Every structure is written in structure tokens, then in C-alpha cells.
Amino acid sequence: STGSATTTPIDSLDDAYITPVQIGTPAQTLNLDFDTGSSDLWVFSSETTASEVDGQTIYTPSKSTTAKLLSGATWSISYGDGSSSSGDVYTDTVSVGGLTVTGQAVESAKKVSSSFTEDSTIDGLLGLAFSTLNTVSPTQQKTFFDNAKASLDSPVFTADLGYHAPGTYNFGFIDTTAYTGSITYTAVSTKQGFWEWTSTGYAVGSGTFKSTSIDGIADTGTTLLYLPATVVSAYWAQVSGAKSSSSVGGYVFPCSATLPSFTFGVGSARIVIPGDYIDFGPISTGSSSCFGGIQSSAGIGINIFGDVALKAAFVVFNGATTPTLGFASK
């Protein structure tokens, strides 16, 4: 089998991407944030504290003839941005782009933190990291990809995120029309549960490439590119007036600037992030200070190849017995 679904930016800045997902019988369609940095499929639901729901579409398990309470199971997750959610668990039929998994764990939120409530466009998350990170207790549950894998024509999914435009998540096949050149594959460590790999270096604009190993994760659920402070300083030093602002929480730059590109290495190959992809707009409405799309990872503990980096590439998440990542230009 295969599936193919369009993923759409939630706003004009590409702050996140939403993909329609069918849950239950008859189908209830929710727009989920596909997140290769986590491993829980959780949704706003008829069980979510009413004051914490503000415009999201909810899953109502009592209206699904295929929903079954997973007795005794609870979940609770905290993300790197400080947001969180928790609740109980159903199994139900879940379809993405024509690919169907029966018995998928659908984690129903009883509580969500304010940032989820405040984002009316995101009805939940669909985790695509390794199932070892799944938070369901006392019986850990498998991701949608893990459940689908055996049925897929090839044990892969691909992320093709758009810049200020829709893109595609495919399951089970590699669309050879969706990228240019060849796909360069690189090793993955699953030891932390992430699609963790090592970039071979970087360049800023037209500058010379610096060969240096940068371990980090391919994370579709993180908006920005988080890299070591040395790398990030080298980038922003090329932008007149750019500075790290403790009050804002990162590098800012004059909105009047034209940003240089940023290149990262994948083996001997190179992925070029155009400068415009690094502009996240005014820090507050009407400000002429703009927020940078490349930020330091120093306070995180891991480097994160988030959407800013991934949307410059066609990315293969290869879930074969030994997983690997592939990157192609597009």
C-alpha cells in the first residue's frame, strides 16, 4: 500500500504545517501536525477541557463505531517549546492520504497547554519519530508509520514541505518526480528515539564550505533551524544589524535586510536554504525588527534541522531494519 497527503502551512510564515487525517467510522477529519520529532498521535477531543478548546476540530470517539477505549491507558507529553498535553487513549481506524491503519492508538486530550489552545489551526499531532518515545502508559503504543510499515510497498515516508506553499507527505514510495538530482542517504542513530544524523558542514551565502560534523535531528515539528552557537554567529555576522536579543529570545535582524542563503552538508552533497526561508517576520506586529530562522541550539541540548532546513529538500525517512535519512534538492 501507499498513501499521499498534502501538507499546508498554517500561516504566512510557515510556522507549522497541517495535514488532514481521517479518524474513526464514519471518518472524522482532523488537521494534524506531522512531527518527526515525537511519537504520539494525539487529538483535541470531546474529552478536552472546554475552556482549552478554541476553534479546533475535535475527535468524538463516542460517534465512531470503530473506536475502543484502551483500558487503563494514559499519556502525557511535554515538548521542547514548553507546551504539553495529556489524556486517555482509544484505538480506532486512522487513514492518511488513502493509507489506512486499523487499531491505531489515538490519544485523546483531556488537557492541553495554552499554546495548543491558542493555535486554532492545529487539531493535534501525528508523531513520526521512533515508537520508543511514545508516552502511553502502561503499554507503550506504536506510531502510525510503525503500524503501517509492514503493509507499505517500501518501509519509508517522505517529507516535501513547501516554502510559503503546500507540500506533500508520502508513505510507502519515493516520488522520483519530486526532486532534482539524486538522493543522498546518511546514517541515523535511533538511540534517542529521533531521526538523528550528522551533517558534514555548512556554508553562509557564497562563502566557502566549512567541513565539520553537526549531529542533529530531522524534525518536521520544529519550525526553525537550531545549530551550534558558533555556526549561528557566523551566519548572522553576514547580516548588517543582526544581533542576539535576550529579551526577544534569539537573533533578530532588520526587516529591511536581504538575507544570505545557508548551505548544509549531507555527505558530499549540499542542500541550499535560500535566504528568504530564514525570515520569520516582525517580532511583533508593525515592528521593523524581524525574527531569524536560524537560532542557537545552545540552550536545547540537541541541534534541530527543523522546517527551515527540511523545506529546502526532499527528505526520505527510511524505516528499513537499519533506518537512514535521504536528502535531495528540489
Cite the active site residues: 35, 199
In Å, how far are 138, 186, 202 from 268, measured between CA atoms? 44, 10, 11
Chain breaks in the chain (C to N over 2.5 A) after: none
Dihedral sign, Cα of residue 311, residue 19, residue 303, residue 292: positive
The number of beta carbons lying within 10 Å of the beta carbon of residue 279 is 19
Identify the bridge partners of residue 5 per DSSP, sorted by sequence position.
169
Q: How many helices (H) and strands (E) does the chain have?
A: 4, 24
**Distance from the first to the final alpha carbon of the chain:** 25
Separation CA 252–CA 239 (nearest Å):
10
| Closest among 34, 317, 298, 300 to 197, alpha carbons compared | 317
What is the DSSP-derived secondary structure letter of residue 324?
A: E
